[PDB]
Design a protein around this nucleic acid. Structure first.
Ligand SMILES: [Cl-]
Ligand SMILES: [Mg+2]
Ligand SMILES: [Mg+2]
Ligand code: NA
Length: 329
DNA sequence: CGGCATACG
DNA sequence: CGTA
DNA sequence: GCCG
């Protein structure tokens, strides 16, 4: 009844098992902070299975036969069903290790490895990091300075005005180039912690060299609070977004792809992260084909699949098409 | 047991 | 290392 | 942590 890969089933943004999935995702996140990527994946997959169910889990028996539910994930659900809390989850939540790793990894420019090193050095708060600026990269300094604004969600109502500003710079950089909203907003989210855009041009090859030209124009408009080039095809920036009487910093990702690759880039950048990992795993392990954001490779024939749409890609993988709103794994 | 997505800055 |  |  429930297939094993998240790319084989629709997963809507809102669902019927929110509390159970959130608890499993705490355990997944904590596994990542300890470097246990396998455990992270299992807990994420188990949470995602619950998101895909048609109604609430009320009884432990309803987990029998569901993929990714073994002894540990079933016990978590059992405790939530019987007591409304799971002791392991609550112990993680209150733990100094979890809280500090979460806070540090939320900083733009800081990953698990850096956060863990700082934790082992005794650092615990953002002000601890600010007092030791010699140990920070320029990217991390920007992430730290902007952390408060970047912690507040972007509204879908903000995304449209931002897209128009990006489109104006893109049109001057290369007339005819287009801007497509991707990421979580394309999956239907009403908020997010950044905004993701994919840029292309209908004439193959015209997009070469485009992103530096776009970034220079946005910087000249005064809109870029931070970017790494203040040749490339992805830029992870901090943008100035207007607010009543002021403004706030927002994370924006910009990506350029040639139109031949656009369906693959659109698929990859639309997410969710788990959906794409599961889709690439399915492609390789079940179909023998290698998938990335540039193409789909048959390693036996040594050929790439041309695709003109995301629908083409799902068909070439033998999967029923899922619209972006059903990719919220 | 091996495997766990696969890129670019 | 960081980012997705 | 779980699948195959
Ligand atoms: Cl692990
Ligand atoms: Mg996003
Ligand atoms: Mg993003
Ligand atoms: Na980070």
């Amino acid at each position: 009844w429930m297939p094993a890969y998240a790319c084989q089933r629709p997963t809507p943004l809102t669902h019927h098992n929110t509390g159970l999935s959130e608890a499993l995702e705490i355990l997944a996140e904590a596994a990542g902070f300890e470097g246990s990527e396998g455990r992270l994946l299992t807990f994420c997959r188990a949470a995602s299975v619950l998101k895909a169910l048609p109604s609430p889990v009320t009884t432990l028996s309803q987990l029998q036969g569901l993929p990714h539910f073994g002894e540990h994930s079933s016990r978590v659900v059992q405790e939530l069903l019987e007591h409304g809390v799971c002791e392991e989850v609550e112990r993680v939540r209150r733990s100094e290790r979890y809280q500090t790793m979460k806070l540090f990894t939320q900083i733009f420019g800081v990953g698990v490895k850096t956060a863990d090193r700082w934790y082992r050095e005794g650092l615990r708060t953002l002000d601890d990091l600010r007092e030791q600026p010699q140990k920070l990269t320029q990217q991390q300094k920007a992430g730290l300075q902007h952390h408060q604004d970047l912690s507040t969600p972007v509204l879908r109502s903000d995304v449209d005005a931002l897209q128009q500003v990006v489109e104006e710079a893109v049109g001057q950089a290369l007339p005819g180039a287009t801007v497509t909203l991707t990421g979580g907003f394309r999956r239907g989210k009403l908020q997010g912690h950044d905004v993701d855009f994919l840029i292309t041009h209908p004439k193959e090859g015209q997009e070469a060299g485009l992103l530096p030209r776009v970034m220079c124009r946005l910087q000249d408009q005064g809109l870029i609070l931070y970017h790494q080039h203040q040749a490339f095809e992805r830029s992870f920036c901090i943008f100035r977004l207007p607010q009543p009487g002021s403004w706030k910093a927002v994370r924006v990702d910009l990506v350029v792809a040639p139109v031949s690759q656009f369906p693959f880039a659109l698929l990859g950048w639309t997410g969710s992260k788990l959906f794409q990992r599961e889709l690439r795993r399915f492609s390789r392990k079940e179909k023998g084909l290698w998938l990335n954001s540039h193409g789909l490779f048959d390693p036996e024939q040594k050929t790439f699949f041309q695709a003109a749409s995301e629908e083409d890609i799902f068909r070439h993988l033998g999967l029923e098409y899922l619209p972006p709103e059903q990719r919220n794994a």
